[PDB]
Design a binder for this molecule. Structure first.
Ligand SMILES: CCCCCCCCCCCCCCCCCC(=O)O[C@H](COC(=O)CCCCCC)COP(=O)(O)OCCN
Ligand SMILES: CC(C)CCC[C@@H](C)[C@H]1CC[C@H]2[C@@H]3CC=C4C[C@@H](OC(=O)CCC(=O)O)CC[C@]4(C)[C@H]3CC[C@]12C
Ligand SMILES: Cc1cccc(COc2ccccc2C(=O)N(CCCN)Cc2cccs2)c1
Ligand SMILES: CCCCCCCCCCC
Ligand SMILES: CCCCCCCCCCC
Ligand SMILES: CCCCCCCCCCC
Ligand SMILES: CCCCCCCCCCC
Ligand code: NA
Ligand code: NA
Ligand code: NA
Ligand code: NA
Lengths: 833, 108, 50, 100, 49
């Protein structure tokens, strides 16, 4: 729709006050009305990165606004960036106008264009990044007389830097006449420009062709205003590597900023020029006190310059002193994206955990109003700052802990389906913090194990309120828990103070004979009995041994005993069931109404509440309910044995088979549910066909459920589709049987069961450490892993060997060596003349 | 197949052991419900083991949780059957049985 | 599991079809061996299936 | 099956147009999702008379449809105007009690 | 998506890095550099004769 045009033969105020904003940058593309322009894949990429740079910095792009070649391509990339701001101001047998430039200002036109861009270079700006002065860059890529005087009237009149590149007619000439000092090279303009564009010279006079030598040689009077985008730069970020190096040349060669090292820094920080700021600013010949490196640091954090945050820290900057109380609150509401904070609302409400509630409250108390480094780390983790958060992680104190808390915080924010691009990136970043915490902890465990396991259970000083183990189970970090350091820790927490090298049977035979513990039979690590009978392998072995002897005594009570009076056997049957209930109520904490959602732990409570009702029917003294108190004991005897069968089932397949099992358990429960649905519908069909048509009660609703199980434990033409029922009901129920068989397969497999073997054993170790009959009777290590982190960061940094075998340093280290041989060849010719 | 077999042999022996445990508990429940309440000997301890195999070779509200036993005892015993089937899979596979084929033949 | 299922559904339907073919041939063999040798109707073609 | 050399080449060229349409659409879905899903159901101005989704099911283009952009589109077409972040049980208990 | 296609064609075109690491340009860019050194060796012999 839009596009403004002004016929023209003082100007700048009629477009910054009436129309639009201010310029942090200003690019000049000069080709002129070249009706042909060979757009390669390279030149299509150079002038597409350039408009993205002008989109980022907010520049004006002055060019000739006619619909030909580059200037129609520059215009159509501008509307591509307004589809996915850029102000492409245009100034111009006959050319047609370009319908893609934002403002039009239409040979005869290249004087008002110069005297405008020479005025914007003249300005003084109180924002003052480039010493004020509004950075002007002039590109050049093609040939002709017009683009030659455009480089002239830029460089000669004022100081805008000019960038050329080696693909074109005369921009390849000046790309060849800059790697040469020949005392201005008075006729090498003729020795160039003819052998690389031979048809333009035989179209005009000699006195103007020599004027082109006068044109070119006054460009080269200042080679600090001439950057060349060379051809071998086959990579991204080479336009901004040339624009910033052109702006750094024109700024630093003002002969006024010798005391102004900071203005060179903020320029080289806005562009991502790390390898230029390291060797031209931080070289210890320049005098800085590392005290004014703080406002430059706060800009390196908010604009996401991760390589500059790392450079400021390794040149001396105490990040603990820098992160004051108000810098964190100029960072959590000023520089916090609201799309993440809106996504932080949905994660806190829909998938709520204990870590998120600390994170949601610590985001809030900074946007409403002490571990400062671990607040900057969460700030750069929530916003998916991929490489800034890797710099702050290396400065934290609890580094294995914060690598797991970040890996949990991202894994919860990637459970939100509000945007699967942000939820796909943060899941990917969480999978490389869990990997970051594996290989840091295997570095900690390759040192002494007593310190690395001191670190697993560190009290966190309220990081999230949990140690590294608790923060890894809730994140379901299967790679952190399947590592051999954590598995060795759990197998020592389960074997207890008994050594794991004694034997397996040697522990069991000490239960049946107590005086074998006091000898040198077991090789544990004065009253070793309180150490033997507190290890949860012995507590589990005694509880199963007690539970079998409880079932062999409940079998004697049921058959031989139980005449009419609850004699001395049946009273202690309450007391053994009472400690099977007293431990359940003391484990009835931490349930959340989801502990009973597994059909083997609600079965435990429903086996006692179906047994307590057997003590109710016991103490009624009538034969009509004494026998009803026996059939509810005999039915409950099978429930107590299936729990023993389930204990033997889990404790034998506690390994690689614990994933196949307990997935097949809920797959057979679904088949038995579908079989119960079919037996109900078979019961209605069998009751509706047979007799007693209308003679009914609530007899029916209690028989139809059970009549097919009593059936388990007129043929006119309907008998043939009765078989088609038994060819359909057999098919849909056998498929549910085979889905139960093979459903464990479909759906890295070592870390799946090692997480489950960890999660089940730590669930049992979180019970009481005393056996069944006796339930009624009841910053020095953070400094160590800071050493272990620096040893680890050396490992991953010197793994750049297959990138060191990429010889891009060796492809160019002999270019300096062949030019060392080149220049000595030339000067020895000058002596013998 | 010498790794699949003899791993499935000790996996079916565990299922038959758990089935024998369940048939013992089914025998106590069937003997305790039926008659001959207090008229006993060592007749009981030798019959309860065998009465369910002779069974293999008042409904007030307890009959519905009797089916929930046959929906639990079927579940925990069929899982032990399928663990016996598929337990050979979980756990370079050519050198596992070539060691066992060597170890059995050198044992003979 | 939606690929394992509905591939096993048409694989059990083929087994139940082959089982129905075998039960038909078992019905002819059991009817031809037992009595009522030549005393027949369309009683036979509706019983041998069942 | 008239010539399995020409039928082996055109199957190979079809498998790299489906791949050409996966990685173009994941580029479209790494930008805003409301425009990429505007594009899945484009009325084609009679290209073949069908959108990108209808032209991918009949081709059995399993790689175009298993990509996370198309799976996220369908899980929004199935959850409807309900957000997928509510809960699973939270939707069901509103059927039994309309004022929730 | 015409904008989204041109962003995509940039991705697959600049994936020629393992073919750029094939140094067939670098095997011949020094042949012009060694011949730059070669011809200057020959003409300096012609001056001292
Ligand atoms: C009615 C009351 C019925 C009473 C039942 C009688 C019980 C008889 C004793 C059988 C023990 C059950 C075996 C469970 C099991 O296999 O778990 C086994 C234990 O195996 C052994 O201890 C070796 C010899 C056991 C022989 C015991 C006499 C699991 O072994 P483990 O814990 O080392 O490995 C776990 C991960 N695979
Ligand atoms: C007639 C009765 C009283 C004598 C038979 C005694 C057994 C019924 C008891 C004593 C030894 C017990 C076992 C001791 C060692 C094993 C293996 C153990 O599993 C592991 O060691 C896994 C390692 C880990 O979890 O890290 C779990 C308990 C279990 C099955 C116990 C289950 C029941 C057992 C066999
Ligand atoms: C009927 C009934 C009701 C309550 C308690 C019991 C006694 O149960 C045990 C006996 C011996 C050892 C451990 C237990 C025992 O508590 N487990 C079973 C352990 C193996 N899955 C419960 C659980 C622990 C971890 C997850 S589940 C029996
Ligand atoms: C790990 C093997 C354990 C064998 C059982 C020990 C003997 C138990 C019975 C002792 C009376
Ligand atoms: C009409 C009954 C057809 C026979 C059913 C055989 C099913 C066998 C299931 C074994 C897993
Ligand atoms: C209550 C009995 C339900 C039927 C049990 C079917 C089990 C089939 C096992 C075949 C491997
Ligand atoms: C996804 C879990 C849904 C649970 C069922 C909700 C309750 C249904 C019964 C309400 C009377
Ligand atoms: Na059936
Ligand atoms: Na069946
Ligand atoms: Na059974
Ligand atoms: Na069974």
């Amino acid at each position: 729709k839009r596009g403004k045009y002004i016929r023209l033969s003082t100007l700048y105020d009629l477009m910054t006050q009436h129309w639009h904003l201010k310029t942090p940058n200003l690019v000049i593309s000069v080709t002129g009305g070249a009706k042909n322009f060979a757009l390669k894949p390279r030149m299509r990429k150079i002038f597409s990165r350039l408009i993205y740079i002008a989109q980022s910095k907010g520049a004006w792009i002055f060019t000739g606004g006619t619909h030909y070649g580059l200037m129609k391509y520059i215009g159509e990339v501008v509307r591509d960036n307004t589809i996915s701001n850029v102000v492409a101001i245009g100034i111009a047998p006959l050319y047609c106008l370009d319908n893609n430039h934002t403002h039009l200002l239409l040979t005869t036109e290249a004087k008002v264009r110069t005297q405008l861009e020479k005025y914007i270079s003249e300005r003084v700006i109180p924002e003052s990044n480039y010493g004020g002065k509004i950075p002007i860059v002039c590109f050049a890529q093609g040939g002709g007389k017009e683009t030659l005087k455009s480089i002239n009237v830029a460089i000669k009149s004022k100081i805008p830097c000019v960038v050329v590149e080696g693909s074109g007619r005369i921009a390849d000439v000046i790309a060849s006449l800059v790697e040469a000092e020949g005392t201005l090279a008075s006729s090498c303009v003729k020795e160039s420009l003819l052998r690389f564009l031979p048809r333009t010279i035989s179209r005009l006079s000699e006195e103007e062709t020599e004027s082109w030598i006068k044109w070119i040689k006054e460009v080269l009077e200042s080679p600090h205003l001439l950057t060349v985008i060379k051809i071998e730069e086959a990579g991204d970020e080479i336009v901004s590597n040339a624009i910033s190096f052109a702006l750094y040349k024109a700024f630093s060669t003002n002969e006024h900023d010798r005391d102004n090292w900071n203005g060179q820094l903020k320029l080289l920080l806005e562009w991502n020029q790390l390898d230029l700021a390291s060797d031209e600013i931080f070289t210890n010949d320049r005098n800085w006190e590392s005290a004014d490196l703080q406002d430059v640091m706060f800009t390196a954090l908010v604009k996401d310059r991760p390589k500059f945050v790392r450079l400021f820290l390794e040149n001396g900057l105490n990040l603990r002193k820098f992160l004051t109380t108000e810098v964190l609150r100029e960072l959590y509401t000023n520089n916090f994206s609201s799309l993440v904070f809106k996504n932080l609302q949905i994660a806190k409400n829909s998938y709520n955990d204990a870590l998120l509630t600390f994170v949601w409250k610590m985001v809030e108390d900074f946007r409403r109003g002490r571990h400062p480094l671990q607040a900057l780390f969460i700030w750069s983790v929530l916003q998916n700052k991929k490489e800034l958060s890797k710099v702050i992680w290396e400065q934290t104190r609890g580094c294995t802990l914060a690598a797991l808390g970040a890996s949990k915080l991202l894994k919860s924010m990637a459970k939100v389906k509000n945007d699967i691009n942000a939820a796909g990136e943060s899941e990917e970043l969480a999978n490389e913090y869990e990997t970051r915490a594996v290989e840091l902890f295997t570095e900690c465990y390759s040192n002494d194990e007593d310190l690395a396991e001191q670190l697993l259970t560190y009290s966190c000083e309220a990081w999230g309120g949990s140690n590294c183990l608790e923060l890894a189970v809730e994140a379901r970090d299967q790679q952190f828990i399947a590592q051999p350091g954590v598995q060795n820790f759990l197998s020592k927490q389960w074997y207890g103070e008994i050594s794991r090298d004694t034997k397996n049977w040697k522990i069991i035979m000490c239960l049946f004979f107590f005086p074998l513990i006091g000898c040198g039979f077991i090789s544990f690590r004065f009253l070793y009995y309180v150490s033997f009978f507190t290890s949860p392998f012995v507590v589990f072995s005694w509880n199963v041994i007690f539970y079998i002897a409880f079932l062999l005594l409940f079998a004697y009570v049921l058959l031989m005993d139980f005449q009419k009076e609850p004699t001395a056997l049946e009273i202690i049957l309450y007391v053994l069931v009472f400690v099977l209930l007293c431990d359940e109520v003391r484990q009835w904490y931490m349930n959340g109404s989801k502990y009973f959602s597994d059909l083997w732990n609600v079965m435990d409570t429903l086996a006692i509440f179906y047994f307590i009702a057997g003590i109710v029917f016991r103490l009624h003294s009538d034969e009509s309910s004494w026998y009803s108190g026996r059939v509810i004991f005999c039915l409950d005897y099978i429930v107590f044995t299936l729990r023993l069968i389930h204990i033997f089932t889990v404790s034998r397949n506690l390994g690689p088979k614990i994933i196949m099992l307990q997935r097949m358990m809920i797959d057979v429960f679904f088949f038995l549910f579908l079989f119960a649905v079919w037996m109900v519908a078979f019961g209605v069909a069998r009751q509706g066909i047979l007799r007693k048509n209308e003679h009914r009660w609530e007899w029916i609703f209690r028989s139809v459920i059970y009549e097919p199980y009593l059936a388990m434990f007129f043929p006119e033409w309907i008998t043939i589709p009765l078989v088609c029922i038994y060819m359909l009901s057999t098919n849909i129920l056998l498929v549910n049987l085979l889905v139960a068989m093979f459903g464990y397969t479909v759906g890295n497999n070592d870390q799946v069961w090692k997480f489950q073997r960890f999660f089940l054993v730590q669930e049992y170790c979180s019970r009481l450490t005393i056996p069944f009959p006796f339930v009624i009777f009841a910053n020095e290590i953070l400094a160590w892993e800071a050493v272990m982190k620096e040893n680890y960061l050396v490992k991953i940094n010197t793994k750049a060997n297959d990138s060191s075998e990429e010889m891009v340093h060796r492809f160019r280290q002999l270019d300096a060596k062949l030019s060392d041989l080149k220049g000595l060849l030339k000067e020895i010719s000058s002596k013998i003349k």
